[PDB]
Design a binder for this molecule. Structure first.
Ligand SMILES: N#C/C(=C\c1c[nH]c2ccccc12)c1n[nH]c(N)c1C#N
Length: 325
């Protein structure tokens, strides 16, 4: 019902800061930028590589689908607010196609190595280092009043050789205001907090912290995704087989959450599992008591009890990354 950190931070800022409908982007010319290669199409997006001919700075170009002005302003405004923030993808320009008049956003390029080939090779230290760096990103945007709402491996770009991390794709990010009711059609199925799966709209930054748990578990147990749901119903079932079904009803009770009657026939009764149930010889080298303590405190039904980004950065799991700063 209310975020445990930074709950009020947007109300203590100028309305200009969080009133995105009133933001006016200056739309440049999308012809100075020359497409090279469609690094993958998407929902309201298709993404390409290219060169700022005005000097030759490599870049990435995300071509919005302008049947929603408001979503466009929301994202532009949020990136304006996070410019130069710890580990956030730098937005360079906002542009449009002259003859076509369709808008687009231009992003610093990143030689990322694909998580599907990089998670195979991470050491126990790598995992702690990059997670810390993802945490810094999340504590920044949260303290700037903002929920990412789509934390997941594809949106955590990692240049292993430069040891750089950039969290990206802010087309779902949103200003947090207390008591505000949000859409649950955010985040990838596998990284959706249970609040979204039970349709509880009064959520907050703590959702990203669940998403981050999911990433952490997949990394130290090498099961990616960790909670591999078939749909939104099955996803909550997968979670409950691990966290226990009694500890789910307790949450719903606490927050007065109406449970769709279709869950009765499929939830069953499950006990809370031991996070050691997931260790085996292929991932033992990545799992430590301090790693499972962090994990237990990230993946909770009660979004309010979830470790914040700053609490998590303080965890002993990260003491190896602190000293090596
Ligand atoms: N995920 C993401 C983003 C781009 C991509 C989307 N599909 C891809 C497939 C292969 C290589 C890159 C991307 C993104 N947003 N901003 C950037 N510089 C990005 C990059 N790369």
């Amino acid at each position: 019902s209310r975020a445990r950190v930074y709950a009020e931070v947007n109300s203590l800022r100028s309305r200009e800061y969080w009133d995105y409908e009133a933001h006016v982007p200056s739309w440049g010319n999308q012809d100075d930028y020359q497409l090279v290669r469609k690094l993958g199409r998407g929902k309201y997006s298709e993404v390409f590589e290219a060169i700022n001919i005005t000097n030759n700075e490599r870049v990435v170009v995300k071509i919005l689908k302008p049947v929603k002005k408001k979503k466009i302003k929301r994202e532009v405004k949020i990136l304006e607010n996070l410019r130069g923030g710890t580990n956030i993808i730098k937005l360079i320009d906002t542009v449009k196609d002259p003859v076509s008049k369709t808008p687009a956003l231009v992003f610093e390029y990143i030689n990322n190595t694909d998580f599907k080939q990089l998670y195979q090779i991470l050491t126990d230290f790598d995992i702690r280092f990059y997670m810390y760096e993802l945490l810094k990103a999340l504590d920044y945007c949260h303290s700037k009043g903002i929920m990412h709402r789509d934390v997941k491996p594809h949106n955590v770009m990692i240049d292993h050789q430069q040891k750089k991390l950039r969290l990206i794709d802010w087309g779902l990010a949103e200003f947090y205001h207390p008591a505000q009711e949000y859409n649950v059609r955010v985040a990838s199925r596998y990284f959706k907090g249970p609040e979204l799966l039970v349709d509880y709209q009064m959520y907050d930054y703590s959702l990203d912290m669940w998403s981050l748990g999911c990433m952490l578990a997949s990394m130290i147990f090498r099961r990616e995704p960790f909670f591999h749901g078939q749909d939104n119903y099955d996803q909550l079932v997968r979670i409950a087989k691990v966290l226990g079904t009694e500890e789910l009803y307790g949450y719903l009770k606490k927050y007065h959450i109406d449970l769709d009657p279709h869950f009765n026939d499929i939830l069953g009764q499950h006990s809370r599992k031991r996070w050691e149930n997931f260790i085996h010889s292929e991932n033992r080298h990545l799992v430590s008591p301090e790693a499972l303590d962090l994990l237990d405190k990230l993946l909770r039904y009660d979004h309010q009890q979830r470790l914040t980004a700053k609490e998590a950065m303080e965890h002993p799991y990260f003491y190896p990354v602190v000293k090596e700063q």
